[PDB]
Amino acid sequence: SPSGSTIEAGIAYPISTGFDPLTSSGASSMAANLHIFEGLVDLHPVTRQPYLALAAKEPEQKDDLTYYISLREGAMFHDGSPVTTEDVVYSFERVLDPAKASLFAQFIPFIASVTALDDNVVEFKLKYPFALFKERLTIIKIVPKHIVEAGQSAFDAKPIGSGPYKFVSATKDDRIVFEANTVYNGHYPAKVEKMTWFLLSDDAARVTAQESGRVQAIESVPYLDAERLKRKNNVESVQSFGLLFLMFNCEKAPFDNPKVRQALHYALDKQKLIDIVFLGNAKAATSYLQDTHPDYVKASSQYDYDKAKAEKLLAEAGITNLTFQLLATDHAWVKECAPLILESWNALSVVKVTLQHLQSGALYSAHVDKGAYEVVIAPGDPSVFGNDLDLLLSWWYRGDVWPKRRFRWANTAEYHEVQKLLDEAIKNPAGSKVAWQKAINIIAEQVPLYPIIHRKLPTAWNTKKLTDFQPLPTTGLSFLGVGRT
Numbered sequence: 342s343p344s345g346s347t348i349e350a351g352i353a354y355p356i357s358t359g360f361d362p363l364t365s366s367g368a369s370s371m372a373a374n375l376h377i378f379e380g381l382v383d384l385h386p387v388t389r390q391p392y393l394a395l396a397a398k399e400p401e402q403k404d405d406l407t408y409y410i411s412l413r414e415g416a417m418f419h420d421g422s423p424v425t426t427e428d429v430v431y432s433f434e435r436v437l438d439p440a441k442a443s444l445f446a447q448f449i450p451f452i453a454s455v456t457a458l459d460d461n462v463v464e465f466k467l468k469y470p471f472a473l474f475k476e477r478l479t480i481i482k483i484v485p486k487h488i489v490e491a492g493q494s495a496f497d498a499k500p501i502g503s504g505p506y507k508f509v510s511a512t513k514d515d516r517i518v519f520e521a522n523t524v525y526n527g528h529y530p531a532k533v534e535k536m537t538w539f540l541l542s543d544d545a546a547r548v549t550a551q552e553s554g555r556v557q558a559i560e561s562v563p564y565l566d567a568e569r570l571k572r573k574n575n576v577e578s579v580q581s582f583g584l585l586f587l588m589f590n591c592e593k594a595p596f597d598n599p600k601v602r603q604a605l606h607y608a609l610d611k612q613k614l615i616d617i618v619f620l621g622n623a624k625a626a627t628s629y630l631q632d633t634h635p636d637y638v639k640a641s642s643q644y645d646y647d648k649a650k651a652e653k654l655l656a657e658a659g660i661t662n663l664t665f666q667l668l669a670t671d672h673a674w675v676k677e678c679a680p681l682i683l684e685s686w687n688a689l690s691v692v693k694v695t696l697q698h699l700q701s702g703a704l705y706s707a708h709v710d711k712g713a714y715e716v717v718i719a720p721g722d723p724s725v726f727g728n729d730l731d732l733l734l735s736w737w738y739r740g741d742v743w744p745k746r747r748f749r750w751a752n753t754a755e756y757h758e759v760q761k762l763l764d765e766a767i768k769n770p771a772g773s774k775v776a777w778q779k780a781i782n783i784i785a786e787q788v789p790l791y792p793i794i795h796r797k798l799p800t801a802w803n804t805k806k807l808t809d810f811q812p813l814p815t816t817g818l819s820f821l822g823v824g825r826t
């Protein structure tokens with residue numbers, strides 16, 4: 342009975358993108374969209390298991406290339422309109438259309454066409470068989486065509502979906518407000534009438550909110566505060582793909598030289614970062630994946646701290662007096678890693694580095710997407726979309742979204758080989774493990790964008806106030822199925 346009760350939560354990530362699922366890659370926007378939008382099939386935020394959302398029943402697989410999905414009876418958008426098969430077609434076609442510049446088409450490269458057969462059934466035709474078809478549907482949220490066509494920017498700021506919570510408002514550095522969608526008839530109806538996410542990127546403010554009872558759960562517990570929070574709260578730390586990456590503009594001298602990119606990895610003392618910033622709750626990367634991922638295989642290139650090796654590579658690359666600027670995001674823990682990275686690099690005999698911090702939204706729109714940068718450290722976690730290896734590789738390495746328009750490595754022979762390998766692993770599934778490891782090993786040698794560390798992710802919540810809350814293995818918070826005591 343969502344009347345008389347509310348949920349308040351502390352979210353760690355500022356709003357850095359809008360909410361249009363065409364482009365909403367910001368951590369806090371994606372988390373909101375788990376509640377505002379539905380796919381045809383969604384993955385549970387905690388268990389990652391698929392469940393029927395806008396699909397009325399299990400997708401009917403006619404053959405390896407053909408699936409039919411029927412819409413849940415009575416499904417409605419938050420404006421009171423029915424969800425239609427045209428809305429489904431529109432949602433997939435806009436992601437697939439290169440002109441629309443989605444951030445996510447590289448997660449559905451196997452879809453050939455989406456067609457409305459009648460007012461209930463949609464036909465999906467695939468380019469080749471893809472066993473994870475249903476699992477990927479969670480990425481393509483179903484949007485109301487009549488709203489989006491009336492103004493994409495307005496929809497991006499005020500999203501309308503079919504999920505159990507309706508968007509009320511979002512105010513930067515303040516809060517996102519949701520309300521129960523009382524016409525939702527899926528599996529996870531809103532258990533409270535109103536939910537407020539306070540945007541508390543400041544570590545201390547976020548912890549204080551939990552301690553004071555201003556919120557019932559907080560994302561991304563600062564490691565230093567975990568012990569004191571345990572007195573009155575549950576604190577649980579979950580193994581995660583979530584990582585800190587080092588990203589180079591590979592078309593700007595001298596970071597177009599792989600030896601320079603390698604050198605800067607070798608120059609970093611990861612154990613010091615882990616001790617000082619993460620309190621042991623992270624591991625230096627030894628592959629693309631974290632070592633607890635089921636598909637982890639250790640990469641053939643390792644970057645254990647070795648200053649002499651860094652110096653040797655720089656001398657081979659002809660570096661005698663390199664001065665560059667590192668851009669970093671503003672996440673409190675990224676701000677803590679940055680000076681330590683700078684100290685390690687400034688200790689090199691031929692490198693001097695300065696630092697600039699920026700909010701993530703401006704970092705991408707004003708610098709990265711234009712190529713107006715040299716080197717970035719930033720956090721990333723595409724495991725929000727799913728946990729399969731093609732997906733995690735594709736986010737950063739399939740197509741153009743990052744390799745062409747962000748880290749600018751798409752003109753290399755190595756990039757083209759990686760594309761062939763990523764395609765082979767999904768078009769020839771019997772060869773996938775071999776093909777993925779070849780791609781990962783090229784990526785790990787070339788280090789265009791590569792993890793420095795993967796981290797354990799702690800969440801805190803009050804079990805006396807919330808029912809059925811569980812922490813995620815990804816960024817965000819989930820209140821699907823969660824109520825108040």
Ligand SMILES: CC(=O)N[C@H]1[C@H]([C@H](O)[C@H](O)CO)O[C@](O)(C(=O)O)C[C@@H]1O
Nearest residue numbers: 357366367368701705720721722723816
């Ligand atoms: C799926 C994913 O990894 N999203 C990440 C995004 C994107 O890197 C950014 O929006 C550019 O697309 O940035 C963050 O929101 C951020 O830096 O605050 C972290 C988040 O984990």
